[PDB]
Amino acid sequence: SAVPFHGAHQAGIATPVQDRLHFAAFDVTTEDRAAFVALLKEWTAAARRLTAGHAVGEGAYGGLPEAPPDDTGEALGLKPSRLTLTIGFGPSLFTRFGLADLRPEALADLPKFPGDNLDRARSGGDLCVQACADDPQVAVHAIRNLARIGFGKVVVRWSQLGFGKTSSTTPDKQTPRNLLGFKDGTRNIAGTEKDRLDRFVWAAEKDGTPWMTGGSYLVARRIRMHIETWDRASLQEQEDVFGRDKGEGAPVGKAKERDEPFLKAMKPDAHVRLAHPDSNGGATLLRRGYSFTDGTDGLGRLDAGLFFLAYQRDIRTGFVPVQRNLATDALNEYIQHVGSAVFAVPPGVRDADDWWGSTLF
Amino acid sequence: GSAVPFHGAHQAGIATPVQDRLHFAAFDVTTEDRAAFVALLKEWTAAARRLTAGHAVGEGAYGGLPEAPPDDTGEALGLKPSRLTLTIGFGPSLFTRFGLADLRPEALADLPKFPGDNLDRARSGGDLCVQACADDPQVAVHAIRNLARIGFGKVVVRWSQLGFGKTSSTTPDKQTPRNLLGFKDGTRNIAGTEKDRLDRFVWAAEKDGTPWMTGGSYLVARRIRMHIETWDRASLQEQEDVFGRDKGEGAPVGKAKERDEPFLKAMKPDAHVRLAHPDSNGGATLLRRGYSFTDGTDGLGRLDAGLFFLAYQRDIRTGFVPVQRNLATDALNEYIQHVGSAVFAVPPGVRDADDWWGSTLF
Ligand code: HEM
Numbered sequence: 001s002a003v004p005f006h007g008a009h010q011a012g013i014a015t016p017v018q019d020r021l022h023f024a025a026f027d028v029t030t031e032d033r034a035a036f037v038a039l040l041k042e043w044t045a046a047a048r049r050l051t052a053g054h055a056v057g058e059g060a061y062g063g064l065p066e067a068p069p070d071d072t073g074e075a076l077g078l079k080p081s082r083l084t085l086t087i088g089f090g091p092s093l094f095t096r097f098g099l100a101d102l103r104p105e106a107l108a109d110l111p112k113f114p115g116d117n118l119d120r121a122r123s124g125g126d127l128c129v130q131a132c133a134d135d136p137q138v139a140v141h142a143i144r145n146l147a148r149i150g151f152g153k154v155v156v157r158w159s160q161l162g163f164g165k166t167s168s169t170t171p172d173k174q175t176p177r178n179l180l181g182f183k184d185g186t187r188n189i190a191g192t193e194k195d196r197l198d199r200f201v202w203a204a205e206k207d208g209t210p211w212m213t214g215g216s217y218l219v220a221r222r223i224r225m226h227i228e229t230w231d232r233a234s235l236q237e238q239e240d241v242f243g244r245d246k247g248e249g250a251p252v253g254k255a256k257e258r259d260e261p262f263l264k265a266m267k268p269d270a271h272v273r274l275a276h277p278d279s280n281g282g283a284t285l286l287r288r289g290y291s292f293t294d295g296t297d298g299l300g301r302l303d304a305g306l307f308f309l310a311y312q313r314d315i316r317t318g319f320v321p322v323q324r325n326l327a328t329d330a331l332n333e334y335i336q337h338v339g340s341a342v343f344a345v346p347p348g349v350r351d352a353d354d355w356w357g358s359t360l361f
Numbered sequence: 362g363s364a365v366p367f368h369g370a371h372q373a374g375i376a377t378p379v380q381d382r383l384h385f386a387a388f389d390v391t392t393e394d395r396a397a398f399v400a401l402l403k404e405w406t407a408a409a410r411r412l413t414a415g416h417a418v419g420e421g422a423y424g425g426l427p428e429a430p431p432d433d434t435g436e437a438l439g440l441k442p443s444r445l446t447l448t449i450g451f452g453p454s455l456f457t458r459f460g461l462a463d464l465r466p467e468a469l470a471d472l473p474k475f476p477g478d479n480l481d482r483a484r485s486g487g488d489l490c491v492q493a494c495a496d497d498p499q500v501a502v503h504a505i506r507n508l509a510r511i512g513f514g515k516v517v518v519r520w521s522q523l524g525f526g527k528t529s530s531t532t533p534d535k536q537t538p539r540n541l542l543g544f545k546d547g548t549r550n551i552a553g554t555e556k557d558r559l560d561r562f563v564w565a566a567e568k569d570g571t572p573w574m575t576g577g578s579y580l581v582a583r584r585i586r587m588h589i590e591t592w593d594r595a596s597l598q599e600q601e602d603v604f605g606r607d608k609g610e611g612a613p614v615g616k617a618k619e620r621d622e623p624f625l626k627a628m629k630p631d632a633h634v635r636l637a638h639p640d641s642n643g644g645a646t647l648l649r650r651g652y653s654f655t656d657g658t659d660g661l662g663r664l665d666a667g668l669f670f671l672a673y674q675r676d677i678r679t680g681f682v683p684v685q686r687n688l689a690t691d692a693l694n695e696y697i698q699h700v701g702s703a704v705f706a707v708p709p710g711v712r713d714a715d716d717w718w719g720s721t722l723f
């Protein structure tokens with residue numbers, strides 16, 4: 001019930017997709033390069049403990065009565081829950097500490113896209129920690145404590161709780177459904193396809209930024225779903241939008257969910273057709289997103305949707321082109337991008353002496 | 362992953378074991394046609410029946426006539442019942458309508474003002490409530506979603522709260538959960554098996570004076586925010602002084618085990634347990650059933666966080682009202698703030714597949 005924290009790559013990218021998610025973006029408040037590398041090493045030290053199910057530092061209790069506990073404790077006696085912890089570096093981070101010439105080109109700023117309604121507050125970030133586990137309380141505990149450890153050095157800019165499937169009740173040999181009611185993930189890069197990952201996800205040494213070798217580039221979008229609207233369309237409209245039938249997830253005309261799609265059979269603005277790599281010169285992404293529901297608004301409407309997360313070897317040749325191709329997507333009627341960030345995701349923590357970002361600092 | 366049984370003398374989601382996730386929604390009625398509303402009630406009851414047993418509402422999520430939108434939104438498809446439960450309540454404001462005034466029970470008292478109170482009126486009150494709990498949040502969401510969709514026009518959603526993890530227990534035999542302050546929360550609650558405790562402190566009785574409420578129970582909801590920043594920089598001793606138990610095991614102060622009976626005069630005069638305990642309140646006993654929430658950041662660089670506190674009792678005036686009044690000197694106050702309020706009468710359980718929600722009031 002745990003995922004090895006060390007390795008060539010960071011866990012949480014090609015490893016099994018866990019049930020829950022706490023994504024937080026942080027802004028750096030120090031300009032001390034030393035202070036920062038110090039926190040990086042501290043943060044790594046605590047990541048090792050949390051991914052193995054231990055409290056941070058000297059535990060949640062049993063210390064000097066007069067000190068505050070090292071660990072806030074609400075993970076006591078829960079299991080590691082396959083917790084993974086992925087840290088990434090926003091572009092604005094490279095304006096500090098004199099790293100401006102270390103910024104990888106593939107960490108390209110997103111264009112503004114048609115329809116964009118980017119909420120500036122829930123956008124961007126100097127760095128991020130993706131926290132995945134099957135128990136949401138573990139994930140949150142992780143973020144809470146990491147915030148606490150870097151307090152005075154970093155602050156939480158925005159935070160996003162999500163969920164996918166509940167592995168306690170659904171088969172992993174079965175495709176999860178998003179809040180629009182369709183199966184989601186059918187044509188994705190899978191953690192087993194090492195050659196796919198090497199070609200489309202991991203950064204190569206010869207890519208141009210040696211410190212990113214084995215890292216990846218992450219694109220995040222908070223995507224609101226106009227639910228009450230979508231719910232009023234007919235089954236045929238809905239099935240028309242993506243190009244798959246709702247109940248079985250089959251590409252129009254075909255019988256099974258995993259039949260290869262025949263795209264001409266799909267309406268020319270169908271999602272699957274416009275996202276498909278054959279539509280995009282080969283561009284193929286690893287999608288690792290979670291649905292979200294934050295509650296209601298002032299208008300009565302469900303505040304729900306897809307927290308879309310994509311990993312790629314180069315933002316320019318991965319997300320950018322595919323997002324460009326969805327200008328005309330039929331889905332646009334029912335969604336709206338309302339927050340966004342990119343991050344270079346450094347390679348793994350190689351052993352117990354390594355630390356997060358060592359290749360950079 | 363089983364199903365919880367929907368029919369009964371009482372509604373599920375109360376004495377039932379606490380499921381992991383919560384999705385709570387408060388509804389306001391927008392129609393004045395009482396037949397229209399009674400029709401709603403019957404149709405919601407029929408929907409709930411399908412939903413708690415793992416089925417699509419209506420004709421299903423697909424395979425209907427293509428030109429028409431599907432009966433079920435379809436995102437529970439392939440998911441188990443997941444111990445889903447649907448509990449409905451009636452807010453005080455509902456009796457102003459449909460000539461239901463004279464039936465509003467005495468035990469649905471409005472709450473007085475409490476010092477500290479900072480209540481957002483947008484996220485307070487409500488004509489009625491659906492409490493949906495489930496071990497899968499997708500299942501929880503799906504139920505609220507489809508109930509609202511069916512009710513389009515006759516009701517709208519005033520506000521909602523998702524609880525991402527439980528901080529209550531109705532089963533003292535399974536481990537007690539921790540709230541976001543780090544302490545076990547649930548130890549001395551009321552258990553779903555103590556049937557006589559349930560009757561004396563939770564179920565409404567005929568003799569209690571409003572006959573349609575027999576087999577029911579009244580519900581208080583407080584949205585309580587936690588100043589975790591403040592709390593996270595207090596000493597371990599201060600934290601333990603605040604409640605009167607220790608953080609590691611959750612034992613009353615001095616004693617060695619979580620379930621040992623607390624000895625109240627070893628605790629500080631203002632410790633939370635010492636003040637909340639029934640002996641300090643004439644025996645007032647609550648069935649706590651709350652969940653934790655976190656809603657983004659607070660915009661000041663910290664995580665928003667708190668506890669959606671839910672309490673069930675036979676009479677608000679002899680339950681929440683005295684305990685909360687006694688908490689006016691609780692040491693815990695310096696770390697929390699009440700920011701949302703709302704009470705509800707919860708009717709008795711649907712007896713069978715002919716009965717319907719509120720059939721006893723209507
Ligand atoms: C609410 C927003 C979105 C929804 C509901 C959605 C839904 C879906 C669905 C149902 C499928 C078919 C099954 C599958 O996952 O293979 C799909 C495929 C796909 N989507 Fe999305 N998507 C959304 C946003 C995006 C974005 C922002 C991108 C890229 C920038 C994207 C790219 C893709 C790709 C690459 C595929 C695989 C296409 C294939 O090879 O068949 N989607 N999506």
Ligand code: HEM
Nearest residue numbers: 540544545546547548549550585637638639668684685697
């Ligand atoms: C964030 C808000 C609150 C927190 C964190 C909290 C925390 C706790 C904790 C840790 C316990 C340990 C004992 C147990 O669960 O058996 C407890 C007990 C209790 N709390 Fe609270 N509490 C909160 C608010 C309230 C409120 C608002 C009430 C009533 C209005 C209340 C009434 C009680 C009662 C009656 C007990 C157990 C009494 C007994 O049988 O000993 N609590 N609470």
